[PDB]
Amino acid sequence: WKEAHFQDAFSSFQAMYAKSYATEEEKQRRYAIFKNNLVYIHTHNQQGYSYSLKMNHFGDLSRDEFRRKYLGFKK
């Protein structure tokens, strides 16, 4: 895909989940994470697994951010 495809995909993501960003630095970081996740999902779904992946409201989070705030089991 070209950059414009990723750019369109991120705008749709922003619209669909009402994601906005308080700084241009945050938006560029979140765009980069989003692109990386999007590529991951697309590649994964070509590999013939028993399960599929799909973009969702965690699309602009890295694994570390996801783990730190969106889980919560502490033994």
Binding site: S50, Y51, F58, K74, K75
Partner: protein, 223 residues
């Protein structure tokens, strides 16, 4: 106890004992959702009545038992609170805000109560099936890996870690002819836009620890 004596499948959803999928949002409150789901299911299994219960109460009011609201917690400490405090309020009475706040449990009626809580015997699929025959079961898993973050549908048989960091609920089990794999039916708390309308079909035969560690720290309320 004999496996023949267990049903081929169990799904508490189609028995009417599972509330709609909920969403913890950006708060480390999964433990509270796993707890309320187990209590909703156990109460309904016993009485035939499904009452949606308060995660926020658990978050706000169970710090004495070891839980830390959006900073994390565990299901057994939450069951202990429910036992300690004489029960839990309804979701409607004490709704979910996804934020830390002071306890207001004087503000509502305790609608569901427990006698105690039990751990599922460890590292046994048969023991988990037997528990699920009785009611939904609270489980802890590692849920931070990318395939987990973006899971959509199908039997999730991904190579999974066992660093337990998320608390969810099993509501049954069955078998998938598409992938030819047996599964557990898991209910998450990340809303209906994640997974299969909020659910995940987890591979059943992934060794003694369970898929993503689900046989390591499973428990349920006794009513």
């Amino acid at each position: 106890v004999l496996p023949s004596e267990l049903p081929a499948g169990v799904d508490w959803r189609s028995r009417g004992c599972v509330t709609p999928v909920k969403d913890q949002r950006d708060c480390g409150s999964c433990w509270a959702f796993s707890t309320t789901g187990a209590l909703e299911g156990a109460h309904c299994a016993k009485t035939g009545k499904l009452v949606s219960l308060s995660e926020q109460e658990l978050m706000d009011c169970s710090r004495a038992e070891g839980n830390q609201s959006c900073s994390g917690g565990e299901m057994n400490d939450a069951f202990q609170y429910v036992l300690d405090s004489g029960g839990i309020c309804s979701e409607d009475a004490y709704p979910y805000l996804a934020r830390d706040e002071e306890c207001r449990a004087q503000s509502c009626e305790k609608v569901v109560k427990i006698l105690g809580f039990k751990d599922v015997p460890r590292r046994s699929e048969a023991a988990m099936k037997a528990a699920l025959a009785k009611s939904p079961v609270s489980i802890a898993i590692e849920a931070d890996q990318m395939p987990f973050q973006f899971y959509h549908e199908g039997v999730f048989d991904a190579s999974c870690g066992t660093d337990l960091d998320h608390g969810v609920l099993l509501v049954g089990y069955g078998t998938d002819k598409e992938s030819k794999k047996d599964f557990w039916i898991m209910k998450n708390s990340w809303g209906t836009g994640w997974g299969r309308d909020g659910y995940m079909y987890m591979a059943m035969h992934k060794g003694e620890e369970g898929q993503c560690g689900l046989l390591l720290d499973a428990s349920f309320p006794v009513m």
